Amino acid sequence: GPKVGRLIYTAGGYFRQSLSYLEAYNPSNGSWLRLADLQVPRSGLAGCVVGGLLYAVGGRNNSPDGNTDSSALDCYNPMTNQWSPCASMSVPRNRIGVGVIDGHIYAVGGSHGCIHHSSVERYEPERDEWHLVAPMLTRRIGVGVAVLNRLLYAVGGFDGTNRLNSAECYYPERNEWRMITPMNTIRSGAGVCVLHNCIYAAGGYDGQDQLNSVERYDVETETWTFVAPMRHHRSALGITVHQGKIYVLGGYDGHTFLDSVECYDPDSDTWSEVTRMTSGRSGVGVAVTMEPC
Ligand SMILES: O=C(COc1cccc(N2CCC(C(=O)O)CC2)c1)NC1CCCCC1
Ligand SMILES: [Cl-]
């Protein structure tokens, strides 16, 4: 089916305060477009796409005048270059993870003030409704989430006391979570995505440093294996997959809010630096959909 005309969208983020930017990168020509701002600036949000619409989920608006954790779900239509509110979640979720299974959005974990959630809820676009599902076995904020073979994975994060190397899997037809093999590295605020038969965890903070290492979980063999490291150490990086490659966007390296975007080729096991965002930032949401009109 059609593959051309897709862009990598980055929404929100953090640099000095939370940001409202929506910008889209075209890998086929290197261009960036600035599109309609989010209604509310947010960092620590997640992006995903269902039915060609881009959704921005959760986060927090940090500003000089305070911090407000977000329960929002907002949907951006590339055909109109407009955002519309959707039904809000049961609870604010900053530093959230999301995944999509069969047209439904799962919102996982995140914080609300000092509350570190284990709760999980599922959005039905056809009905514009959220409903809670079974909670995780561990409270997780800064959690990485990805979907492979219609199973939902929650990887790493911070439980309110410790940063985590643990990970777990949600089996929808049983409404049940089970632990999987833990990662080799503690990772809070890693980029987590799916490519081929593996769940990749790139970067993050281990409690001591921002990481450039990357490891992948083979869902058949249940092992975690390191791949080539990124050029940059990064925590709170954006991540997505497009045409068989992983793209990582921004993050914090311990010194700078990065503007660089790196791309991982699994065939050569190498990372290359492919572009730069218009400004450095961390805590963005990222997803792929059609270019706007
Ligand atoms: O960009 C943001 C806000 O969005 C996110 C999004 C995803 C994860 C995180 N955290 C990173 C550190 C982790 C940890 O410390 O364990 C906990 C999770 C933050 N916040 C910035 C981060 C860089 C420093 C300045 C604030
Ligand atoms: Cl998605």
mmCIF file of C-alpha atoms and ligand atoms in Angstrom:
data_model
loop_
_atom_site.group_PDB
_atom_site.id
_atom_site.type_symbol
_atom_site.label_atom_id
_atom_site.label_comp_id
_atom_site.label_asym_id
_atom_site.label_seq_id
_atom_site.Cartn_x
_atom_site.Cartn_y
_atom_site.Cartn_z
ATOM 1 C CA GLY A 1 0.000 0.000 0.000
ATOM 2 C CA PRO A 2 0.965 3.667 -0.307
ATOM 3 C CA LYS A 3 4.204 4.708 1.364
ATOM 4 C CA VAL A 4 5.129 8.117 -0.109
ATOM 5 C CA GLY A 5 4.351 11.519 1.310
ATOM 6 C CA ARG A 6 4.886 10.824 5.018
ATOM 7 C CA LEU A 7 6.587 13.190 7.455
ATOM 8 C CA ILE A 8 8.064 12.841 10.928
ATOM 9 C CA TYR A 9 6.065 15.157 13.196
ATOM 10 C CA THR A 10 7.479 16.504 16.463
ATOM 11 C CA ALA A 11 5.031 18.060 18.919
ATOM 12 C CA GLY A 12 5.732 19.996 22.074
ATOM 13 C CA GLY A 13 8.882 19.657 24.105
ATOM 14 C CA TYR A 14 10.941 21.505 26.662
ATOM 15 C CA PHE A 15 13.606 24.173 26.523
ATOM 16 C CA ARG A 16 13.490 26.580 29.491
ATOM 17 C CA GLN A 17 9.694 26.034 29.502
ATOM 18 C CA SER A 18 7.234 23.706 27.782
ATOM 19 C CA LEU A 19 6.735 24.357 24.081
ATOM 20 C CA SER A 20 3.783 24.457 21.695
ATOM 21 C CA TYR A 21 5.692 23.708 18.495
ATOM 22 C CA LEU A 22 4.422 21.327 15.843
ATOM 23 C CA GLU A 23 7.133 20.819 13.215
ATOM 24 C CA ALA A 24 7.403 18.156 10.523
ATOM 25 C CA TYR A 25 10.504 16.760 8.817
ATOM 26 C CA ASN A 26 10.506 15.259 5.327
ATOM 27 C CA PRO A 27 13.215 12.582 5.053
ATOM 28 C CA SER A 28 12.907 12.605 1.258
ATOM 29 C CA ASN A 29 14.141 16.201 0.860
ATOM 30 C CA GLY A 30 15.511 17.300 4.251
ATOM 31 C CA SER A 31 12.938 20.049 4.729
ATOM 32 C CA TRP A 32 11.192 21.149 7.899
ATOM 33 C CA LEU A 33 7.765 22.772 8.154
ATOM 34 C CA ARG A 34 6.344 24.669 11.129
ATOM 35 C CA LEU A 35 2.647 23.813 11.484
ATOM 36 C CA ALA A 36 -0.177 24.781 13.838
ATOM 37 C CA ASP A 37 0.918 25.234 17.441
ATOM 38 C CA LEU A 38 -0.597 23.082 20.126
ATOM 39 C CA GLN A 39 -3.407 24.838 21.968
ATOM 40 C CA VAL A 40 -1.513 24.306 25.256
ATOM 41 C CA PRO A 41 2.306 24.019 25.426
ATOM 42 C CA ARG A 42 3.352 20.630 26.715
ATOM 43 C CA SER A 43 6.486 18.626 27.435
ATOM 44 C CA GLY A 44 6.529 15.006 28.488
ATOM 45 C CA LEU A 45 3.697 14.187 26.083
ATOM 46 C CA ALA A 46 3.450 11.361 23.590
ATOM 47 C CA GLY A 47 2.454 11.372 19.933
ATOM 48 C CA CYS A 48 0.754 8.655 17.931
ATOM 49 C CA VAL A 49 -1.290 8.309 14.762
ATOM 50 C CA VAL A 50 -4.595 6.562 14.108
ATOM 51 C CA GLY A 51 -6.500 6.850 10.845
ATOM 52 C CA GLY A 52 -4.176 9.518 9.499
ATOM 53 C CA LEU A 53 -4.780 11.822 12.469
ATOM 54 C CA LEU A 54 -1.985 12.846 14.822
ATOM 55 C CA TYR A 55 -2.759 12.641 18.533
ATOM 56 C CA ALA A 56 -0.937 14.473 21.341
ATOM 57 C CA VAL A 57 -1.447 12.738 24.688
ATOM 58 C CA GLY A 58 -0.726 13.951 28.197
ATOM 59 C CA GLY A 59 2.346 15.878 29.284
ATOM 60 C CA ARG A 60 2.823 18.947 31.457
ATOM 61 C CA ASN A 61 2.806 22.676 30.823
ATOM 62 C CA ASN A 62 5.807 24.107 32.648
ATOM 63 C CA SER A 63 5.897 27.899 32.542
ATOM 64 C CA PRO A 64 7.153 30.721 34.762
ATOM 65 C CA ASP A 65 3.676 30.775 36.323
ATOM 66 C CA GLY A 66 3.558 27.110 37.288
ATOM 67 C CA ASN A 67 3.235 23.500 36.259
ATOM 68 C CA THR A 68 0.024 21.854 35.120
ATOM 69 C CA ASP A 69 0.009 18.134 34.346
ATOM 70 C CA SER A 70 -2.181 17.319 31.376
ATOM 71 C CA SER A 71 -5.009 14.847 30.951
ATOM 72 C CA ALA A 72 -5.533 16.130 27.418
ATOM 73 C CA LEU A 73 -5.956 14.246 24.175
ATOM 74 C CA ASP A 74 -5.786 16.553 21.148
ATOM 75 C CA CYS A 75 -5.991 15.496 17.513
ATOM 76 C CA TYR A 76 -4.320 17.255 14.583
ATOM 77 C CA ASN A 77 -5.681 16.824 11.065
ATOM 78 C CA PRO A 78 -3.012 17.338 8.385
ATOM 79 C CA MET A 79 -5.699 18.080 5.804
ATOM 80 C CA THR A 80 -6.831 21.180 7.732
ATOM 81 C CA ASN A 81 -3.691 22.073 9.741
ATOM 82 C CA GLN A 82 -5.925 22.380 12.800
ATOM 83 C CA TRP A 83 -5.986 20.848 16.256
ATOM 84 C CA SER A 84 -9.248 19.714 17.882
ATOM 85 C CA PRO A 85 -9.833 18.593 21.470
ATOM 86 C CA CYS A 86 -10.792 14.994 22.064
ATOM 87 C CA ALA A 87 -12.049 13.381 25.253
ATOM 88 C CA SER A 88 -9.673 13.797 28.176
ATOM 89 C CA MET A 89 -8.143 10.949 30.116
ATOM 90 C CA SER A 90 -9.225 9.893 33.586
ATOM 91 C CA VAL A 91 -6.103 11.447 35.116
ATOM 92 C CA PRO A 92 -3.227 13.808 34.224
ATOM 93 C CA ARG A 93 -0.203 11.925 32.874
ATOM 94 C CA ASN A 94 3.154 13.688 32.489
ATOM 95 C CA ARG A 95 6.092 11.698 31.071
ATOM 96 C CA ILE A 96 3.566 9.263 29.616
ATOM 97 C CA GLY A 97 4.029 6.402 27.198
ATOM 98 C CA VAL A 98 1.550 5.463 24.493
ATOM 99 C CA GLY A 99 0.981 2.642 22.062
ATOM 100 C CA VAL A 100 -1.660 1.870 19.438
ATOM 101 C CA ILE A 101 -3.301 -1.535 19.011
ATOM 102 C CA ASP A 102 -5.967 -2.083 16.358
ATOM 103 C CA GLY A 103 -6.940 1.566 16.168
ATOM 104 C CA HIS A 104 -7.058 2.139 19.931
ATOM 105 C CA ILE A 105 -4.676 4.351 21.916
ATOM 106 C CA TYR A 106 -3.240 3.045 25.179
ATOM 107 C CA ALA A 107 -2.053 5.667 27.659
ATOM 108 C CA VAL A 108 0.438 4.195 30.116
ATOM 109 C CA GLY A 109 1.785 5.481 33.394
ATOM 110 C CA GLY A 110 3.089 8.999 33.848
ATOM 111 C CA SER A 111 2.952 11.366 36.807
ATOM 112 C CA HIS A 112 0.434 13.718 38.377
ATOM 113 C CA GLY A 113 2.380 15.748 40.885
ATOM 114 C CA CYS A 114 4.088 13.277 43.178
ATOM 115 C CA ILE A 115 1.691 10.499 42.059
ATOM 116 C CA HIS A 116 3.521 7.970 39.855
ATOM 117 C CA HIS A 117 0.862 5.993 38.021
ATOM 118 C CA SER A 118 0.645 2.293 37.351
ATOM 119 C CA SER A 119 -2.749 2.888 35.759
ATOM 120 C CA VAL A 120 -3.422 2.402 32.050
ATOM 121 C CA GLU A 121 -6.380 3.479 29.929
ATOM 122 C CA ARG A 122 -7.550 2.901 26.365
ATOM 123 C CA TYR A 123 -9.106 5.376 23.918
ATOM 124 C CA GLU A 124 -11.659 4.420 21.266
ATOM 125 C CA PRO A 125 -11.627 7.045 18.465
ATOM 126 C CA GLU A 126 -14.932 5.798 17.040
ATOM 127 C CA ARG A 127 -16.699 6.616 20.318
ATOM 128 C CA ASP A 128 -14.423 9.413 21.627
ATOM 129 C CA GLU A 129 -14.211 7.623 24.981
ATOM 130 C CA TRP A 130 -11.484 6.449 27.343
ATOM 131 C CA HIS A 131 -11.792 3.472 29.677
ATOM 132 C CA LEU A 132 -9.370 2.109 32.234
ATOM 133 C CA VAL A 133 -7.784 -1.304 31.718
ATOM 134 C CA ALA A 134 -5.626 -3.372 34.038
ATOM 135 C CA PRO A 135 -2.802 -1.398 35.696
ATOM 136 C CA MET A 136 0.843 -2.282 35.280
ATOM 137 C CA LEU A 137 2.667 -4.324 37.884
ATOM 138 C CA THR A 138 4.996 -1.350 38.512
ATOM 139 C CA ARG A 139 4.406 2.400 38.702
ATOM 140 C CA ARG A 140 6.289 3.986 35.786
ATOM 141 C CA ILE A 141 6.934 7.545 34.656
ATOM 142 C CA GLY A 142 9.372 8.364 31.886
ATOM 143 C CA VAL A 143 8.326 4.977 30.560
ATOM 144 C CA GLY A 144 8.953 3.791 27.021
ATOM 145 C CA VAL A 145 6.025 2.091 25.321
ATOM 146 C CA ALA A 146 5.773 0.220 22.057
ATOM 147 C CA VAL A 147 3.513 -2.298 20.318
ATOM 148 C CA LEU A 148 4.701 -5.413 18.509
ATOM 149 C CA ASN A 149 2.389 -8.149 17.226
ATOM 150 C CA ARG A 150 -0.584 -6.560 19.005
ATOM 151 C CA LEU A 151 1.097 -6.816 22.409
ATOM 152 C CA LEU A 152 1.912 -3.680 24.420
ATOM 153 C CA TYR A 153 5.276 -3.241 26.160
ATOM 154 C CA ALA A 154 6.159 -0.840 28.988
ATOM 155 C CA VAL A 155 9.900 -0.445 29.422
ATOM 156 C CA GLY A 156 11.991 1.221 32.112
ATOM 157 C CA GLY A 157 11.060 4.495 33.746
ATOM 158 C CA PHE A 158 10.943 5.698 37.340
ATOM 159 C CA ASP A 159 8.570 4.328 40.007
ATOM 160 C CA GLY A 160 8.740 7.271 42.446
ATOM 161 C CA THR A 161 11.864 5.968 44.198
ATOM 162 C CA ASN A 162 14.073 4.106 41.708
ATOM 163 C CA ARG A 163 14.896 4.269 38.048
ATOM 164 C CA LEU A 164 14.088 0.940 36.427
ATOM 165 C CA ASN A 165 15.620 -1.693 34.168
ATOM 166 C CA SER A 166 12.449 -3.771 34.369
ATOM 167 C CA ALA A 167 9.880 -4.169 31.614
ATOM 168 C CA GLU A 168 6.465 -5.759 31.248
ATOM 169 C CA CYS A 169 3.966 -6.782 28.576
ATOM 170 C CA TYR A 170 0.192 -6.334 28.347
ATOM 171 C CA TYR A 171 -1.834 -9.170 26.786
ATOM 172 C CA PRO A 172 -5.079 -7.460 25.722
ATOM 173 C CA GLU A 173 -7.308 -10.503 25.396
ATOM 174 C CA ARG A 174 -6.503 -11.407 29.002
ATOM 175 C CA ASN A 175 -6.379 -7.828 30.299
ATOM 176 C CA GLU A 176 -3.192 -8.842 32.103
ATOM 177 C CA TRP A 177 0.374 -7.603 32.567
ATOM 178 C CA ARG A 178 3.363 -9.914 32.983
ATOM 179 C CA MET A 179 7.015 -9.104 33.548
ATOM 180 C CA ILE A 180 9.459 -9.724 30.719
ATOM 181 C CA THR A 181 13.228 -10.102 30.907
ATOM 182 C CA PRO A 182 14.703 -6.890 32.353
ATOM 183 C CA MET A 183 16.995 -4.718 30.311
ATOM 184 C CA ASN A 184 20.724 -4.800 30.835
ATOM 185 C CA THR A 185 20.644 -1.076 31.684
ATOM 186 C CA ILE A 186 18.506 1.078 33.947
ATOM 187 C CA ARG A 187 16.744 3.545 31.631
ATOM 188 C CA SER A 188 14.417 6.363 32.630
ATOM 189 C CA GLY A 189 13.347 8.619 29.777
ATOM 190 C CA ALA A 190 14.590 6.357 27.007
ATOM 191 C CA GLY A 191 13.243 6.290 23.479
ATOM 192 C CA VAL A 192 11.357 3.036 22.953
ATOM 193 C CA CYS A 193 10.103 1.808 19.586
ATOM 194 C CA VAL A 194 9.576 -1.309 17.517
ATOM 195 C CA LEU A 195 11.543 -2.318 14.448
ATOM 196 C CA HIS A 196 11.240 -5.728 12.783
ATOM 197 C CA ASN A 197 10.870 -8.274 15.600
ATOM 198 C CA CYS A 198 12.425 -6.225 18.370
ATOM 199 C CA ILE A 199 11.641 -3.584 20.962
ATOM 200 C CA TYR A 200 14.463 -1.021 21.001
ATOM 201 C CA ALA A 201 15.378 1.090 24.032
ATOM 202 C CA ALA A 202 17.698 3.976 23.142
ATOM 203 C CA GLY A 203 19.330 6.327 25.591
ATOM 204 C CA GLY A 204 17.717 7.432 28.832
ATOM 205 C CA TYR A 205 19.094 8.251 32.265
ATOM 206 C CA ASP A 206 20.466 5.426 34.433
ATOM 207 C CA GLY A 207 20.495 7.397 37.689
ATOM 208 C CA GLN A 208 24.041 8.673 37.077
ATOM 209 C CA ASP A 209 24.390 9.674 33.420
ATOM 210 C CA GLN A 210 22.542 10.189 30.153
ATOM 211 C CA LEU A 211 23.136 7.168 27.935
ATOM 212 C CA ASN A 212 24.138 6.695 24.311
ATOM 213 C CA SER A 213 23.744 2.927 24.502
ATOM 214 C CA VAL A 214 20.898 1.135 22.736
ATOM 215 C CA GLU A 215 19.543 -2.359 23.350
ATOM 216 C CA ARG A 216 16.817 -4.430 21.737
ATOM 217 C CA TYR A 217 14.460 -7.116 23.025
ATOM 218 C CA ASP A 218 13.736 -9.985 20.651
ATOM 219 C CA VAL A 219 10.171 -10.991 21.488
ATOM 220 C CA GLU A 220 10.804 -14.595 20.381
ATOM 221 C CA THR A 221 14.063 -15.257 22.285
ATOM 222 C CA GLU A 222 13.270 -12.988 25.273
ATOM 223 C CA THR A 223 16.793 -11.544 25.337
ATOM 224 C CA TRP A 224 18.116 -7.991 25.341
ATOM 225 C CA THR A 225 21.119 -7.318 23.096
ATOM 226 C CA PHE A 226 23.096 -4.124 22.645
ATOM 227 C CA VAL A 227 23.348 -2.603 19.164
ATOM 228 C CA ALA A 228 25.565 0.254 17.995
ATOM 229 C CA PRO A 229 25.393 3.263 20.347
ATOM 230 C CA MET A 230 24.066 6.651 19.266
ATOM 231 C CA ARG A 231 26.554 9.421 18.585
ATOM 232 C CA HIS A 232 25.029 11.449 21.437
ATOM 233 C CA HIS A 233 24.133 10.655 25.000
ATOM 234 C CA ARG A 234 20.437 11.515 25.367
ATOM 235 C CA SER A 235 17.639 11.427 27.906
ATOM 236 C CA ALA A 236 14.053 12.507 27.189
ATOM 237 C CA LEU A 237 14.558 11.919 23.457
ATOM 238 C CA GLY A 238 11.836 11.646 20.859
ATOM 239 C CA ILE A 239 11.744 8.484 18.773
ATOM 240 C CA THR A 240 9.891 6.970 15.842
ATOM 241 C CA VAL A 241 10.363 4.476 13.026
ATOM 242 C CA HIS A 242 10.043 5.313 9.340
ATOM 243 C CA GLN A 243 10.863 3.126 6.320
ATOM 244 C CA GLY A 244 12.789 0.584 8.308
ATOM 245 C CA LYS A 245 14.962 2.991 10.283
ATOM 246 C CA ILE A 246 14.788 4.436 13.779
ATOM 247 C CA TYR A 247 14.888 8.208 14.147
ATOM 248 C CA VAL A 248 15.831 9.810 17.473
ATOM 249 C CA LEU A 249 15.123 13.514 17.994
ATOM 250 C CA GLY A 250 16.576 15.876 20.549
ATOM 251 C CA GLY A 251 16.904 15.117 24.220
ATOM 252 C CA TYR A 252 19.344 16.264 26.869
ATOM 253 C CA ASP A 253 22.985 15.154 26.911
ATOM 254 C CA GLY A 254 23.903 16.465 30.376
ATOM 255 C CA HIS A 255 25.011 19.836 28.985
ATOM 256 C CA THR A 256 22.841 20.844 26.019
ATOM 257 C CA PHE A 257 19.287 20.427 24.818
ATOM 258 C CA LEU A 258 20.116 18.725 21.542
ATOM 259 C CA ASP A 259 18.851 19.698 18.105
ATOM 260 C CA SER A 260 20.339 16.686 16.377
ATOM 261 C CA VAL A 261 18.333 13.897 14.768
ATOM 262 C CA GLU A 262 20.081 10.542 14.333
ATOM 263 C CA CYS A 263 18.950 7.604 12.211
ATOM 264 C CA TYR A 264 19.656 3.916 12.870
ATOM 265 C CA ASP A 265 20.048 1.444 9.995
ATOM 266 C CA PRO A 266 19.591 -2.125 11.321
ATOM 267 C CA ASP A 267 21.187 -3.682 8.231
ATOM 268 C CA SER A 268 24.567 -2.004 8.774
ATOM 269 C CA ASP A 269 24.069 -1.506 12.542
ATOM 270 C CA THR A 270 25.080 2.151 12.296
ATOM 271 C CA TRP A 271 23.701 5.511 13.346
ATOM 272 C CA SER A 272 24.042 8.609 11.177
ATOM 273 C CA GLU A 273 23.180 12.217 11.897
ATOM 274 C CA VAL A 274 20.597 13.199 9.303
ATOM 275 C CA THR A 275 19.201 16.627 10.247
ATOM 276 C CA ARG A 276 18.755 19.117 13.032
ATOM 277 C CA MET A 277 15.557 20.419 14.517
ATOM 278 C CA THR A 278 14.985 24.157 14.298
ATOM 279 C CA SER A 279 15.998 24.420 17.982
ATOM 280 C CA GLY A 280 17.214 22.076 20.701
ATOM 281 C CA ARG A 281 14.608 20.564 22.999
ATOM 282 C CA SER A 282 13.760 17.496 25.067
ATOM 283 C CA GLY A 283 10.538 15.746 26.029
ATOM 284 C CA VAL A 284 8.827 15.824 22.614
ATOM 285 C CA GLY A 285 6.116 13.612 21.166
ATOM 286 C CA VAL A 286 6.824 12.116 17.736
ATOM 287 C CA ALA A 287 4.802 10.233 15.145
ATOM 288 C CA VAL A 288 4.540 9.710 11.388
ATOM 289 C CA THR A 289 1.670 10.604 9.088
ATOM 290 C CA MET A 290 0.859 12.212 5.752
ATOM 291 C CA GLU A 291 2.145 15.662 4.872
ATOM 292 C CA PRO A 292 -0.348 18.508 5.416
ATOM 293 C CA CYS A 293 -2.263 20.458 2.792
HETATM 294 O O1 LIG B 1 12.028 16.972 28.777
HETATM 295 C C1 LIG B 1 11.571 16.992 29.904
HETATM 296 C C2 LIG B 1 10.163 16.525 30.155
HETATM 297 O O2 LIG B 1 9.818 15.420 29.336
HETATM 298 C C3 LIG B 1 10.310 14.213 29.697
HETATM 299 C C4 LIG B 1 9.917 13.179 28.847
HETATM 300 C C5 LIG B 1 10.327 11.914 29.119
HETATM 301 C C6 LIG B 1 11.099 11.601 30.210
HETATM 302 C C7 LIG B 1 11.513 12.635 31.063
HETATM 303 N N1 LIG B 1 12.311 12.333 32.168
HETATM 304 C C8 LIG B 1 13.753 12.425 31.943
HETATM 305 C C9 LIG B 1 14.591 12.182 33.193
HETATM 306 C C10 LIG B 1 14.201 10.910 33.893
HETATM 307 C C11 LIG B 1 14.929 10.721 35.216
HETATM 308 O O3 LIG B 1 15.498 11.705 35.761
HETATM 309 O O4 LIG B 1 14.893 9.616 35.665
HETATM 310 C C12 LIG B 1 12.701 10.882 34.141
HETATM 311 C C13 LIG B 1 11.945 11.081 32.867
HETATM 312 C C14 LIG B 1 11.108 13.941 30.799
HETATM 313 N N2 LIG B 1 12.243 17.404 30.977
HETATM 314 C C15 LIG B 1 13.625 17.884 30.973
HETATM 315 C C16 LIG B 1 14.590 16.718 30.891
HETATM 316 C C17 LIG B 1 16.026 17.232 30.775
HETATM 317 C C18 LIG B 1 16.363 18.116 31.937
HETATM 318 C C19 LIG B 1 15.386 19.261 32.088
HETATM 319 C C20 LIG B 1 13.932 18.775 32.166
HETATM 320 CL CL CL B 2 1.758 5.560 16.132
#
